[PDB]
RNA sequence: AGGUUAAAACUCAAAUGAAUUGACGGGGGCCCGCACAAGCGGUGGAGCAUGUGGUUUAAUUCGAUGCAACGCGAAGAACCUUACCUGGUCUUGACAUCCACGGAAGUUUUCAGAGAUGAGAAUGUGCCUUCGGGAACCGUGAGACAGGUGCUGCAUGGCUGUCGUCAGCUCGUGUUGUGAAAUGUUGGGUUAAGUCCCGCAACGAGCGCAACCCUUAUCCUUUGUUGCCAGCGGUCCGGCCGGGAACUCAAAGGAGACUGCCAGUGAUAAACUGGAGGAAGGUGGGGAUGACGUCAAGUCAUCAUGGCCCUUACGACCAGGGCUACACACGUGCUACAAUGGCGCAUACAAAGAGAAGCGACCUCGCGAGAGCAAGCGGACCUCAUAAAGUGCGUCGUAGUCCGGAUUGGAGUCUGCAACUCGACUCCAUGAAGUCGGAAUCGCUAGUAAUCGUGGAUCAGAAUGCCACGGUGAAUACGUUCCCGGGCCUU
């Protein structure tokens, strides 16, 4: 906004693990305010991921987030003349938000049976650097690299 | 509203009041489950003989100061415009601008 | 439709007209404005001129018309298509 | 833009209601209609009596009408003859025993309804509207109002194009809820049509 | 190339200079707003509801009709409503006052019509009354008159939208200028604010801002039934009973929030940033509240009103029809396209409100909508009245399907004189389009969006609209370069 008067809102940690990171992931996945449904989906997918891999749910989730998190994005900047796509560094909070949003969108786009299964498959693919939201991170990085010459506007 | 339109309503009210019970007992006979199959027919035929204006369903609530047939309010007997005017003048007891 | 426990509806004037017509050989059309009357199995054969709003159209009552209202056979709106 | 009614917005804060009775939904509309008819008859009958306010109460199976007037002698008549006649007619209209009380409006120049009616009578008598409004404002200010505003709208002076003209003195703080603002309107039926008059009078904050 | 000298006819009532107030600029500077940006969910695609344009019609009544008309007047068109059409009828008249005459008013039936209505046929003939009269209410007779939703919102009052809840708009006296005008109101800061401080040819004042109002968040006192159950005593385990006044709560009166305190910054100012305490911290959240004015904006069909117009008709009554039409176009919505789901069983947790020609329990009957009988309640007591989403278990396994529920056939229920045109709801069967929607476009910054149910006005019956109530409950805002609207100074 113009006035710069927006603070921050505290978020309760998730029940099973007490991680605000996972609580934010549940919030992103939630639709129509059905938080219990979102939590059940997330927990089922996390248990499937944990039994697929050798790490805990939090460790596997962190691996997937590390593989999907972007570092530099492109934003439009209009100056005297034409608008340029300037590459800008992404702050850590936005890195996490983008990683979660891309993962959720990719899982929703997948075509498996259940949403929990789709989320588990997407998380495993992210941990192995395959599939969507990983291609999305790659596309964002490619655009930033192509527009690197404009990193002074 | 027009004077004739107001007179229609007063006539309808008068007719309904006059024929109130003579309609009620006929309707009771018609709706009686244990009634015969010919007294029901006679009651049905007799109900049509009464003037149509005696049925209470023919009445249309109208503003008691203007005759407006739309925007009626039963609690005050007036249309919305007249209710607003009286409320602002302070003539409706206990009624003020609400806010919550 | 009308409840069974109340029986089919019929206007008293039309009932009197059909009673006076069936016993006699009167084949003249029975002019009426009562489109709300159910067709009863007692006036099959004679023609009833039902009002449609601006005129009386004659319907020849047959057996298959029993149970329908008189107005069902007197259309009220004139339509011939757009730009036809 | 449009403004809220100054009396209505203050009806529960600093201003009293003009009707004080309780009823259920069964008789609320009937009571409202009878009050309307009573006020109509009283206003028509006491046209020259300088009636400013008609308060109606219904204690129990009876009607009590308080008439605020600047000419109580004209209202009452000789040994209560006129007020007795009005009591009879009011009882007949309301269908219940009637009791009429007379309240004194001292300083009629500080009463919004009376000022508006006076201006309206002058306009119907073809007095200059400017002179009428200036006189009303000056009288109220001299009597000691903290403020007054007078507004006249219509075909002033028989002009083909209607307009609105207003004068104000002192302060008339219409946005202050606790301000004692007496507001009233009147209409004049001249040969060129209807002219509306509105009067606000400020009497200090409570 | 052209220069230089240099007319006239005809034509207009101006052409022009400087300066003033605005408005405007693809001029400058500084600010604000779901205005962008960051996000979430929609519309435009489908079916249906609803309004409008058009077309059609005897009539499809009239009005609104860039933003600021299009689920708008209408908070509810089968008859009525109704203002429109066809047909049948009346003329001081459906609705008032005045005069003359006959008569109590009223009730009960017959015929004709289709009704309006006409012709009758019986029953009463009361009530003050000096029993001269009346004085209600009817009918007839004239004529002053009644009547008009007929026209002009560009003659008007009243009421409303709108820029915009934007921070603005002005006046008195003084002073400057021949004058229009200017100053104040500009400037340095600051604020949500023409908010406040400082400066200053201005000194003051008014309408606006803020506050006073309602509601919500905390606490205290009083009162304690129909509301409550902590300590007790019983108990059919049901606050059920004796009780208790603690608690939730109901509603009256108070307290509390004021940059009040601390630190830093700042012009020894206004103020800003952070901290403590507190339920709440900087306008705590929401509402009400709409300045001078603008659009000859809307409404003569709520009402009122100047003028005009009709008067055996543009007035009045009735029946039937129409306002519900349908090659099409647009706006606003509802339901979906599914598995974060459908279906079956079981099982929790709300708030707000209404009710007497009303809400209607229990029991019985019916697959069901409902029906019969019949308590209680003008209500913290009774009824409406099971909240749903949610959770547990099972199944469906990606299919135009156990998705979707449009359309149609048959059979019913209820309201209502009367469901054909044209009501709502139920049962059986039927099972359309639709698999996430082009250009384009809308709403929203927090208990919001999204999603889930509940109630109310209108109302005999007739909500997917409108108004209101709770449950669950997000994402994102780096920033002001750009789009839209606006504020201040300057050019
Ligand atoms: K020459
Ligand atoms: K010349
Ligand atoms: K769409
Ligand atoms: K408009
Ligand atoms: K107007
Ligand atoms: K000068
Ligand atoms: K001056
Ligand atoms: K007029
Ligand atoms: K109709
Ligand atoms: K809808
Ligand atoms: K739509
Ligand atoms: K199906
Ligand atoms: K119907
Ligand atoms: K400018
Ligand atoms: Mg009228
Ligand atoms: Mg009705
Ligand atoms: Mg010039
Ligand atoms: Mg955007
Ligand atoms: Mg569509
Ligand atoms: Mg129209
Ligand atoms: Mg028009
Ligand atoms: Mg709307
Ligand atoms: Mg109709
Ligand atoms: Mg206008
Ligand atoms: Mg200014
Ligand atoms: Mg100035
Ligand atoms: Mg101020
Ligand atoms: Mg100054
Ligand atoms: Mg204010
Ligand atoms: Mg206009
Ligand atoms: Mg118009
Ligand atoms: Mg009709
Ligand atoms: Mg319509
Ligand atoms: Mg299905
Ligand atoms: Mg906002
Ligand atoms: Mg209803
Ligand atoms: Mg400003």
CSV table of C-alpha atoms in Angstrom, one decimal, chain D:
chain,number,residue,atom,x,y,z
D,1,UNK,CA,-26.0,16.2,-1.0
D,2,UNK,CA,-29.1,15.2,1.0
D,3,UNK,CA,-29.1,15.8,4.7
D,4,UNK,CA,-30.5,13.8,7.6
D,5,UNK,CA,-33.5,15.1,9.3
D,6,UNK,CA,-32.3,17.2,12.3
D,7,UNK,CA,-35.2,16.2,14.5
D,8,UNK,CA,-35.1,12.5,13.6
D,9,UNK,CA,-31.4,12.1,14.1
D,10,UNK,CA,-31.8,13.6,17.6
D,11,UNK,CA,-35.1,11.8,18.6
D,12,UNK,CA,-33.4,9.7,21.3
D,13,UNK,CA,-30.6,12.1,22.3
D,14,UNK,CA,-31.8,15.6,23.1
D,15,UNK,CA,-35.2,15.7,21.4
D,16,UNK,CA,-38.4,14.1,22.7
D,17,UNK,CA,-41.0,12.2,20.7
D,18,UNK,CA,-44.3,13.8,19.7
D,19,UNK,CA,-46.3,10.7,20.5
D,20,UNK,CA,-45.8,8.8,23.8
D,21,UNK,CA,-47.8,5.6,24.1
D,22,UNK,CA,-47.2,1.9,24.1
D,23,UNK,CA,-49.0,-0.6,21.9
D,24,UNK,CA,-48.6,-4.1,20.4
D,25,UNK,CA,-48.7,-4.8,16.7
D,26,UNK,CA,-52.5,-5.4,17.0
D,27,UNK,CA,-53.3,-1.7,17.6
D,28,UNK,CA,-50.1,0.1,16.6
D,29,UNK,CA,-51.4,1.0,13.1
D,30,UNK,CA,-54.8,1.9,14.4
D,31,UNK,CA,-53.2,4.3,17.0
D,32,UNK,CA,-51.0,5.8,14.3
D,33,UNK,CA,-54.0,6.4,12.1
D,34,UNK,CA,-56.1,7.9,14.9
D,35,UNK,CA,-53.2,10.2,15.8
D,36,UNK,CA,-52.8,11.3,12.2
D,37,UNK,CA,-56.6,12.1,12.0
D,38,UNK,CA,-56.5,14.0,15.3
D,39,UNK,CA,-53.5,16.1,14.3
D,40,UNK,CA,-55.1,16.8,10.9
D,41,UNK,CA,-58.3,18.0,12.4
D,42,UNK,CA,-56.5,20.1,15.1
D,43,UNK,CA,-54.2,21.7,12.5
D,44,UNK,CA,-57.0,22.5,10.2
D,45,UNK,CA,-59.2,24.0,13.0
D,46,UNK,CA,-56.6,26.0,14.8
D,47,UNK,CA,-55.0,27.5,11.7
D,48,UNK,CA,-55.0,31.1,13.2
D,49,UNK,CA,-54.0,29.9,16.7
D,50,UNK,CA,-50.2,29.7,16.2
D,51,UNK,CA,-50.0,26.0,17.0
D,52,UNK,CA,-46.4,24.7,17.1
D,53,UNK,CA,-46.6,21.2,18.4
D,54,UNK,CA,-49.3,18.6,19.1
D,55,UNK,CA,-48.3,15.9,21.6
D,56,UNK,CA,-50.5,12.8,22.0
D,57,UNK,CA,-50.5,10.4,24.9
D,58,UNK,CA,-52.6,7.3,25.6
D,59,UNK,CA,-52.4,6.5,29.3
D,60,UNK,CA,-55.2,3.9,29.5
D,61,UNK,CA,-58.2,3.7,27.2
D,62,UNK,CA,-58.1,7.5,26.8
D,63,UNK,CA,-56.3,10.1,24.8
D,64,UNK,CA,-54.6,13.2,26.1
D,65,UNK,CA,-53.7,15.9,23.6
D,66,UNK,CA,-51.3,18.7,24.6
D,67,UNK,CA,-51.3,21.7,22.2
D,68,UNK,CA,-48.3,24.0,22.3
D,69,UNK,CA,-49.6,27.4,21.2
D,70,UNK,CA,-48.6,31.0,21.3
D,71,UNK,CA,-52.2,32.2,21.5
D,72,UNK,CA,-53.7,30.2,24.3
D,73,UNK,CA,-56.6,32.7,24.7
D,74,UNK,CA,-57.6,32.1,21.1
D,75,UNK,CA,-57.2,28.4,21.5
D,76,UNK,CA,-59.4,28.2,24.7
D,77,UNK,CA,-62.0,30.9,24.0
D,78,UNK,CA,-64.5,32.2,26.5
D,79,UNK,CA,-64.6,30.1,29.7
D,80,UNK,CA,-63.3,27.1,27.8
D,81,UNK,CA,-66.0,26.9,25.2
D,82,UNK,CA,-63.7,26.4,22.2
D,83,UNK,CA,-61.4,23.9,24.0
D,84,UNK,CA,-64.5,22.0,25.2
D,85,UNK,CA,-65.7,21.8,21.6
D,86,UNK,CA,-62.3,20.6,20.5
D,87,UNK,CA,-62.3,18.0,23.3
D,88,UNK,CA,-65.7,16.7,22.1
D,89,UNK,CA,-64.5,16.4,18.5
D,90,UNK,CA,-61.2,14.7,19.5
D,91,UNK,CA,-63.0,12.2,21.6
D,92,UNK,CA,-65.4,11.5,18.7
D,93,UNK,CA,-62.5,11.0,16.3
D,94,UNK,CA,-60.4,8.8,18.6
D,95,UNK,CA,-63.3,6.7,20.0
D,96,UNK,CA,-62.0,7.2,23.6
D,97,UNK,CA,-62.4,9.9,26.3
D,98,UNK,CA,-60.3,12.9,25.5
D,99,UNK,CA,-58.4,15.4,27.6
D,100,UNK,CA,-56.9,18.6,26.1
D,101,UNK,CA,-54.1,20.5,27.7
D,102,UNK,CA,-52.7,23.8,26.6
D,103,UNK,CA,-49.0,24.6,26.7
D,104,UNK,CA,-47.6,28.1,26.4
D,105,UNK,CA,-45.0,28.8,23.8
D,106,UNK,CA,-43.4,32.0,25.0
D,107,UNK,CA,-41.2,33.8,22.4
D,108,UNK,CA,-42.9,32.4,19.2
D,109,UNK,CA,-40.0,34.0,17.3
D,110,UNK,CA,-37.8,31.2,18.7
D,111,UNK,CA,-40.0,28.3,17.5
D,112,UNK,CA,-39.1,26.8,14.2
D,113,UNK,CA,-42.6,25.8,13.2
D,114,UNK,CA,-44.1,29.2,14.0
D,115,UNK,CA,-41.3,31.0,12.2
D,116,UNK,CA,-41.8,28.9,9.1
D,117,UNK,CA,-45.6,29.4,9.2
D,118,UNK,CA,-45.2,33.1,9.5
D,119,UNK,CA,-42.8,33.3,6.5
D,120,UNK,CA,-45.3,31.1,4.6
D,121,UNK,CA,-48.2,33.4,5.4
D,122,UNK,CA,-46.2,36.4,4.3
D,123,UNK,CA,-45.3,34.7,1.0
D,124,UNK,CA,-49.0,33.8,0.4
D,125,UNK,CA,-49.7,37.5,1.1
D,126,UNK,CA,-47.1,38.4,-1.5
D,127,UNK,CA,-44.5,39.9,0.8
D,128,UNK,CA,-40.9,40.1,-0.5
D,129,UNK,CA,-39.3,36.8,0.3
D,130,UNK,CA,-36.0,38.4,1.1
D,131,UNK,CA,-37.6,40.8,3.6
D,132,UNK,CA,-39.5,37.9,5.2
D,133,UNK,CA,-36.4,35.8,5.8
D,134,UNK,CA,-34.3,38.7,6.9
D,135,UNK,CA,-37.0,39.7,9.4
D,136,UNK,CA,-37.2,36.2,10.8
D,137,UNK,CA,-33.5,35.8,11.2
D,138,UNK,CA,-33.2,39.2,12.9
D,139,UNK,CA,-36.0,38.5,15.3
D,140,UNK,CA,-34.6,35.2,16.4
D,141,UNK,CA,-31.1,36.6,16.8
D,142,UNK,CA,-32.4,39.5,18.8
D,143,UNK,CA,-34.4,37.2,21.1
D,144,UNK,CA,-31.2,35.3,21.7
D,145,UNK,CA,-30.9,32.2,19.6
D,146,UNK,CA,-27.3,31.0,19.3
D,147,UNK,CA,-28.0,30.7,15.6
D,148,UNK,CA,-30.7,30.4,12.9
D,149,UNK,CA,-30.9,29.4,9.3
D,150,UNK,CA,-33.8,30.0,7.0
D,151,UNK,CA,-34.1,28.5,3.5
D,152,UNK,CA,-36.8,29.2,0.9
D,153,UNK,CA,-37.0,27.2,-2.4
D,154,UNK,CA,-39.2,27.5,-5.4
D,155,UNK,CA,-40.4,30.1,-7.9
D,156,UNK,CA,-39.4,33.1,-5.7
D,157,UNK,CA,-41.2,36.2,-6.8
D,158,UNK,CA,-43.0,34.3,-9.5
D,159,UNK,CA,-39.8,33.7,-11.4
D,160,UNK,CA,-39.9,31.1,-14.2
D,161,UNK,CA,-36.7,29.4,-13.0
D,162,UNK,CA,-37.0,28.1,-9.4
D,163,UNK,CA,-34.1,28.5,-7.0
D,164,UNK,CA,-33.1,28.2,-3.4
D,165,UNK,CA,-32.0,31.0,-1.1
D,166,UNK,CA,-30.9,30.7,2.5
D,167,UNK,CA,-29.6,33.0,5.3
D,168,UNK,CA,-27.8,32.1,8.4
D,169,UNK,CA,-26.5,33.9,11.5
D,170,UNK,CA,-24.6,32.6,14.5
D,171,UNK,CA,-23.8,28.9,14.5
D,172,UNK,CA,-26.0,26.0,13.4
D,173,UNK,CA,-23.8,22.9,14.0
D,174,UNK,CA,-26.0,20.2,12.4
D,175,UNK,CA,-23.3,17.5,12.8
D,176,UNK,CA,-23.3,17.9,16.6
D,177,UNK,CA,-25.8,15.4,17.9
D,178,UNK,CA,-26.1,17.0,21.4
D,179,UNK,CA,-27.0,20.4,19.9
D,180,UNK,CA,-30.5,21.7,20.6
D,181,UNK,CA,-31.7,22.2,17.0
D,182,UNK,CA,-35.4,23.0,16.5
D,183,UNK,CA,-36.1,22.3,12.8
D,184,UNK,CA,-39.4,22.6,10.9
D,185,UNK,CA,-40.8,23.2,7.5
D,186,UNK,CA,-43.8,24.8,5.8
D,187,UNK,CA,-45.3,25.3,2.4
D,188,UNK,CA,-46.9,28.3,0.7
D,189,UNK,CA,-49.3,27.8,-2.2
D,190,UNK,CA,-48.9,30.9,-4.4
D,191,UNK,CA,-50.4,31.6,-7.8
D,192,UNK,CA,-47.1,30.4,-9.3
D,193,UNK,CA,-46.9,27.1,-7.4
D,194,UNK,CA,-45.5,25.8,-4.1
D,195,UNK,CA,-42.7,27.4,-2.2
D,196,UNK,CA,-41.0,25.4,0.5
D,197,UNK,CA,-39.6,27.0,3.7
D,198,UNK,CA,-37.2,25.3,6.2
D,199,UNK,CA,-36.1,26.8,9.5
D,200,UNK,CA,-33.3,25.7,11.8
D,201,UNK,CA,-32.9,27.3,15.2
D,202,UNK,CA,-30.0,26.6,17.5
D,203,UNK,CA,-30.5,27.0,21.3
D,204,UNK,CA,-27.2,25.8,22.7
D,205,UNK,CA,-25.6,22.4,23.4
D,206,UNK,CA,-27.0,20.2,26.2
